[PDB]
């Protein structure tokens, strides 16, 4: 496991990671208080599957609850009230056991952190920041969903639970928890939630202070039309928006440019995500996924969230693409362990590792066939990927001797290696 910073100093940790999203949205409802036990027990399996890192749920206890019609939720970690680890995924002790087991198996532990807001109204909590001291967004005049003097980012819904993450004392509080997580809970890095809510620069700051050499990824989910008309972003591509965040936070960023193309374009348009970018300084910072806990489905109740779910007929092609191309791929717990895509994903992980494909590997797209046809220059091997294509043989688009590596869905998914 190679470990540096990118050439622009972005925290991609060698650019050779393969991450497992370690949970689905209904875990707290389906395996109440047992998730850490399940992970401790799966640790060897996950390591054997080829993951180099796992994205753990929010460790901070969440006893929240809500309902709007048929919809109900709460306790998943996104509306935490304390830094206490005895929440709905399991106890502090189980967490330590789980992180120990994962780390011992060679999988780095990445924790999901939610600095933007907290469950302010929760009666029994260890963290109580009063009003009028500038700890909250609403301590200032809050026009709308725009930075105010008490919060330099967007707000979460109403903005009444929004923290002034820039207050010396709030910054300090997060900083110390990050360090705690690294020193006692074996953190190998962090997944930053709702990065639209606070300054990118603060993420670099927190990283610099607590885990400068660790892995980090930020979730920036905000399309051009969400910015003000006078903002250069209102007219930028999804690629430029996410890239700009990454340049400032100095952390890889989730490839929402590829996600939007997966959802709105055709397979041929997949080449427009951040990871297909011809400049390696651009593609190397992409963190690709097919679905997450918000965008995809989840076992159990309401099918989970499914805000922007990829249709089952493109799941295999979607994974074939992310596992074989540039950027850093993330595999959804569910596709891997619930829905039976496991065997397929294992093959691809193996293909990616054999070819020596990395965050900055080169990718070329071939225009003359249907579907998506790409040439990936792995460090050990070259791969030809043809998805929903009429391509006949790898030699039509590349020079060299190719063997078939993957052939699934009646040829809708084909991968060859040199
Ligand atoms: O006090 C603040 C606000 O509190 C109340 O808001 C509720 C919402 O109505 C609920 O729908 C819910 O919100 C969830 C949300 O459903 C879910 O997507 C999730 O979103 C995360 C997401 O996982 C993450 O990956 C990324 O996109 O950031 C999001 C926020 O972190 O989690 C939310 C929080 O659990 O819960 C809140 C609070 O219970 C109230 O209705 C509002 O008026 C009020 O302003
Ligand atoms: Ca690495
Ligand atoms: Ca905010």
From Swiss-Prot:
S-S bonds: 140-150, 216-251
Keyword tags: Calcium, Carbohydrate metabolism, Disulfide bond, Glycosidase, Hydrolase, Metal-binding, Secreted, Signal
The enzyme's E.C. designation: 3.2.1.60
Gene Ontology terms, MF aspect: alpha-amylase activity; glucan 1,4-alpha-maltotetraohydrolase activity; metal ion binding; starch binding
Cofactor: Ca(2+)
Subunit structure: Monomer.
Protein's name according to its UniProt entry: Glucan 1,4-alpha-maltotetraohydrolase
Provenance organism: Stutzerimonas stutzeri
């Amino acid at each position: 496991d190679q470990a540096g910073k990118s050439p622009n100093a972005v925290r991609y940790h060698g650019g050779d990671e393969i991450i497992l999203q370690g949970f689905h949205w209904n875990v707290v409802r389906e395996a109440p208080n047992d998730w850490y036990n399940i992970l401790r027990q799966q640790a060897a399996t996950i390591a054997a599957d080829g993951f180099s890192a796992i994205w753990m749920p929010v460790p901070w206890r969440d006893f929240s609850s809500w309902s709007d019609g048929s919809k109900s939720g709460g306790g998943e970690g996104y509306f935490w009230h304390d830094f206490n680890k005895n929440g709905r995924y399991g106890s502090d002790a189980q967490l330590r056991q789980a992180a120990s087991a994962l780390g011992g198996a060679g999988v780095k532990v990445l924790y999901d952190v939610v600095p933007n807001h907290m469950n302010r109204g929760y009666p029994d909590k260890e963290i109580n920041l009063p009003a009028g001291q500038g700890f909250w967004r609403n301590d200032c005049a809050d026009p709308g969903n725009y930075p105010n003097d008490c919060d330099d980012g967007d707000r979460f819904i109403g903005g009444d639970a929004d923290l002034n993450t820039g207050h010396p004392q709030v910054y300090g509080m997060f900083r110390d928890e990050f360090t705690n997580l690294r020193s006692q809970y074996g953190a190998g890095g962090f997944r930053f939630d709702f990065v639209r809510g606070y300054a990118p620069e603060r993420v670099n700051s927190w990283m610099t202070d607590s885990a400068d050499n660790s892995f980090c990824v930020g979730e920036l989910w905000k399309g051009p039309s969400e910015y003000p008309n006078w903002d250069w972003r209102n007219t930028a591509s999804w690629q430029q928006i996410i890239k700009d965040w990454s340049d400032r936070a100095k952390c890889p960023v989730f490839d929402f440019a590829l996600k939007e193309r997966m959802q709105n374009g055709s397979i041929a348009d997949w080449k427009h995500g951040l990871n297909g970018n011809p400049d390696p300084r651009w593609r190397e910072v992409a963190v690709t996924f097919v679905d997450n806990h918000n965008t995809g489905y989840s076992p159990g109740q309401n099918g989970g969230q499914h805000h922007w779910a990829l249709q089952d007929g493109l799941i295999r092609q979607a994974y074939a693409y992310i596992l074989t191309s540039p950027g850093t791929p993330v595999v959804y717990w569910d596709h891997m362990y619930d829905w039976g895509y496991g065997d397929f994903i294992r093959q691809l992980i193996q293909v990616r590792r054999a070819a020596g494909v990395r965050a900055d590997s080169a990718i070329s797209f071939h225009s003359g066939y249907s579907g998506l046809v790409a040439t990936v220059s792995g460090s050990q091997q070259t791969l030809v990927v043809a998805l929903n294509s009429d391509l006949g043989n790898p030699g039509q688009v590349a020079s060299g001797s190719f063997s078939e590596a993957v052939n699934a869905s009646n040829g809708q998914v084909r991968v060859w290696r040199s």
